[PDB]
Structures are given as C-alpha cells and as structure tokens.
Amino acid sequence: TTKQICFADRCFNFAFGEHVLESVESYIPRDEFDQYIMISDSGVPDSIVHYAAEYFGKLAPVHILRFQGGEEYKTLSTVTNLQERAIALGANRRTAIVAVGGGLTGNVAGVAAGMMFRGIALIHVPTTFLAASDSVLSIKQAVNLTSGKNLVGFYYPPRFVFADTRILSESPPRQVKAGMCELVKNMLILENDNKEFTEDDLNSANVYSPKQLETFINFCISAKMSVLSEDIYEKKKGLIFEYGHTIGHAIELAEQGGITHGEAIAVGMIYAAKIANRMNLMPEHDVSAHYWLLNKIGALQDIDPDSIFHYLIEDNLGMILLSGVGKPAMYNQTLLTPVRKTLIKEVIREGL
C-alpha cells in the first residue's frame, strides 16, 4: 500500500508492504539522487542493512555508515561524526540520507540530514513497529544533551518512507507491543466507528502477520494525519497524541530501561484516566475501558512513587485528559488541563 503523507505543504509517499524495497525503483526516479548514505545504529541487524543497500544500490552508489547504538550515544557529537564521514565520501546536495533502523536511528539521521548544507533529502526505512506506526508520522527530530533527553532538535520532514511488513512481522513481540500501546492510544483519544479491524483482532502475544500489521499502519496513518496535517508542530490539537506521556515519560525514566516507551505510556494513560475521574471529568466505565483495551494487547504484563514524581517535576501541572473514550477534555480552549500536584502524586501512589 502507498499513502501520500502531507504536513502542511510538505508531502511524501509512504509505502508499506512485503518486500517494498524490492520496488524502490518505482517510487524514486533514478535521476533524483546521485548517491545514498545509509545510516544505521549498531543495534540494527546487518542482514536488514545489507538487504536495503542492495536495492538502493540499483538507483545509485550506496555507502553504509554505522554508529554506536544506545541512548548514551544519541548526541550532536555522533551527528557531527556522521556528517564529517558523509562529506569525506563526497556527499552533496544531491545525496540522500537513508535511515535504516528504529527511532534512535531515525532521529540521528534526521538531525544529520536537516543540517547538512542546511537540509538534504531524508529517507526512512523503519525496522520496528513503533517507528513505522508512530515516530515516522511526526517530523520532530532530536538528540540528547548530557542534561536531558531530546533537548536539542527541530522539525524536518522526510521525502520517502518504506516499511517492509515482512521484517516488521518478524521483530520481537515485546518491541511490537510498544507500538501497539501507541495504537491503543489512538483508539482511546479519537472517535472512529469505521476501522478495518476490531478488538477481537488484537492479541496479547503480539505476533501478527504482514497483512495484519499493514492494516494497523494504515489505521495509524489515518488517525494521526487527520490531525497533524494541519498542526505540523503538534502544539495545538496535535497535543492529543501526548496522552499518557506526562507521567509515562517520568515512569520510563524511573525504570531506567526496564520497560519500553509503550508500556510506560500505557501506565501513563491509566493514571490519566483515574485522574480525570477524580476530577469529575470521566465516568468510571471509561476508566475500565482503558484497562480492558490495554490488557487485550498485554500492555500490563511485564510491568517507587516518590522517584517517579521527582522525574515528573505552582500547585498545578498541565495534563492532557479525557472526559471519556474518544472525547478529549478542553480547558480555556486548550487541551492542557491544570492538575493538582498533590492529586497526581496520590494516584501514582495508589498504583495499578
């Protein structure tokens, strides 16, 4: 399948299906770029990197640049190093950066492509379900600073995106689950009575066929772009995709790598549902709907309050809340509702 993705006036074609790379020659004219710099962090399977290089090499010369994976290396220093090497290889304004890997690779290659000559073509080849169904449907780019995660970056759109569903269907279950957590998030914050799948199609083992993931990806494209096509910087209505992230982010940090971003956001939504309830916004029934749906994908399986609350850090803190399933709660014509710090800490204390 191929969908046109537009962020304001900047669009790109997103192809996703089995062996999509075996057809890059049908989406990209051979005269478009004169070279491809393939960037992939070490945590990415070589077989995939070499597989992708073989097909892009049919359009023009390909040069593979690998770098040390890990959140500790996602820095401007790594970007600079990749840029220096890209230039030594003869990179120019006709060269295209091909990011093959997950979210970490996407961000590093994204910042690199956005700064070279003040901006060259970025091509995403997502190897994880989270990157293919969520991060690739966002033009935010960023790397870390010694003092914080993703504190430096900017907005930069890609020119092409290719997601191989065969590769995705063979990625580990837990990694697939992290993306499914964000999909359930889309189901909770948006109203949609016309999906190509039901909750009966969700499984806790998180093992799907190529076609089943294709359907999931198609659903996320429709969900996010129905909003982000206009709110390109995700500062208005786009803030809705931040559901579960306020406390989720803090929990993710507190666990120090023990849980995925998806699992953290899942617990974050539940805590957000309870909070909305304690504040007279959301009926208890909708709270249960959060547990029910998340258990269907086994989000709460592989899962200190003071620690969590510390990372989180006036008596109030803004949160994206819902009055009910598919119904975001507004405040001053904004999606940010001020919430009592003492209430947030109490809910975190009660737990799941």
Added chain:
Amino acid sequence: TTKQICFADRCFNFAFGEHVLESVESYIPRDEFDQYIMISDSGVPDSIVHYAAEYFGKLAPVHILRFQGGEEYKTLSTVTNLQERAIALGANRRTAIVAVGGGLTGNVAGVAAGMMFRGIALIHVPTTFLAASDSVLSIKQAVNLTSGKNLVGFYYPPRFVFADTRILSESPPRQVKAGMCELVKNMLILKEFTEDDLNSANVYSPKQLETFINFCISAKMSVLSEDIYEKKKGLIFEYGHTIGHAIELAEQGGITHGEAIAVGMIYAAKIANRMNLMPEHDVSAHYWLLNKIGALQDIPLKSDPDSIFHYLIHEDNLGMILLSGVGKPAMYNQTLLTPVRKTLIKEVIREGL
C-alpha cells in the same frame, strides 16, 4: 528608530539609534521572557557585554556566557557546550538567547537558540557595522565542519534586533569599511544620503550610520521578504562573492570580507564588460563608488592566482552573478547565474587591480 522586518510571515522589530539598549524596556514587554542568556565570543569588548547585561537585567535575570572566538571554534561542538551551560542555569522555553557581537557570535548563538527545545527566542545585539547592516538581515545560521565552512546549519529568524549606533560609530575604521563595501554592493545591484556623505576614512557619526542601516534594511528586504532562503532573486546579494570568497580564503585572514567582495565586484564588472554585457561607463562607476569609501586603497593582497583558483573550483564554465549595468542584474535562462568561461575568470584574477 524602529523598523518591522519580515521574512515571509516571520517578523521582528529592528531598533537602532544611540543607546537603544538603555530603553530596551520600552521595546520588550516585562513578561515576555523570564530569563536572558547573553552569548558573546571572547573577541567582543567586555565593556559592551556588561553594558548590554545591565539593561536587559532591568527586565529579567541575565547570565553571561562567553566562548572562544575564532573560525576554529565556530563548530557544533561549541554550540553544544553553550547549550549545556544554558541548561545548567535553568534555561527553558520562556528564556531568550541574546547574541552580543559580530557574525561569528550571531551564527553560534543562532544555531544554539534554533535547536534548544526545538527553538527558543533569539535576540541580536550586533556590535559590528557589517553585522548590523548585513548579516542580521539574513536568517541563515551555520557553523563549520573540519572539511568545510558553514556546511551544517539551517534557517532561523530572530525576535528582536538592537543596534546601538553610538557603539558602532566608535568601532574601528577597517571594521566599518567592511560593512561599507556591502553597502556599496547594494547601491550597485539595485535613500536618505548621497555619495557626498561617504568618506574614505570610514569614521562616521551615530546619525549617519543610522541612515546607512535604514538604507540596507530597505534594499535587502525588498528582495528577501519573499526569497527567505536566498535561492532565487536573493542571489543578487552574492554579487562580487564568487571570486571574492575565493580571494578571502586564499588570503587566510589578511583581508576583511568586505575588501574581498570589493575586489570581487571589480572583477565581475570587468567580466560583464568583456562579455559585451556591461558598458565601460558602468565599470568605471564601480571604481568610483568604491574609491569614495577607500575600499581599494589598502588591500594587502599576497596570495598567488593559483591559490585563488584552487579555493574557487577545488567543465569550461562557472556561474556568476553579473550586471548589464548599474542597478540592472544580468539575467540568463530566467536565472541570475550567467555561465562564464574559466578563461575570463583566470585572466582577471591574474591581472589584479
């Protein structure tokens, strides 16, 4: 004086006059920012930095951050270090970055502000005539790689610009001249003053500089308001820069950017005339205007033509921005880039001036 400058829908106020900072409060609202992080490379006079910190401090807490000046330090590494220090001082989205200095500081602070939290406020306080009348009238930001200058960067507009003309009128004549060369360029490619107000000593009153600044704003923005990336009609501001930049590099710092561009313009005019595109009377106009600001007087040209050729090309044609006459750009294939035989370029570089 205050002028509203707009690159497409991104606008900012540019105030300039004597002690414009001493009245910053009437230019910026009290609750606009909760903190000001002053960035200034080491080559900038301490008196100016502390002077600017005193007045911005009347609006909110001010922290001064310095860094090693010099082209060697205009890198992403230097930017990263400034970003870490700003964070350690509690920088946030309500914080404003104040760049006090010339082009070097402008670019370093610019890249820093543009990336923090994916973009925070950038305020320029140009300390050189060249920065105040030309570089801050461009939203290009960039730093260098070990393999090339300005290879990494992006486009990022400021929120406010303040040019204290008292400070500018006390800056060194050779510094003033470099910006004056760009002002002459503007006069040739496209005012409240005449050629009579130009002097070769390059010493001017705050008032005269205010008039020059107004002219440059009006001239550049008449084109850049729409060509924000300077990739089309905006290429006209590269006049004299094709060979000029090669010469500047070849001289390794012996000559200022302005001086290099002045020589580059003389060469472009001769080339335009030799290609039957520009009358001799127009060529002479170039020497006349440039001699009034004493741009061709000194010029310690030491490098050899081969070195200049090398930095210039590292095919029998190179593209140049040429004129058919004073104020009349030469168009080619609906572009401002006219193909020029290497033959003519090497000849003019070899003969000098």
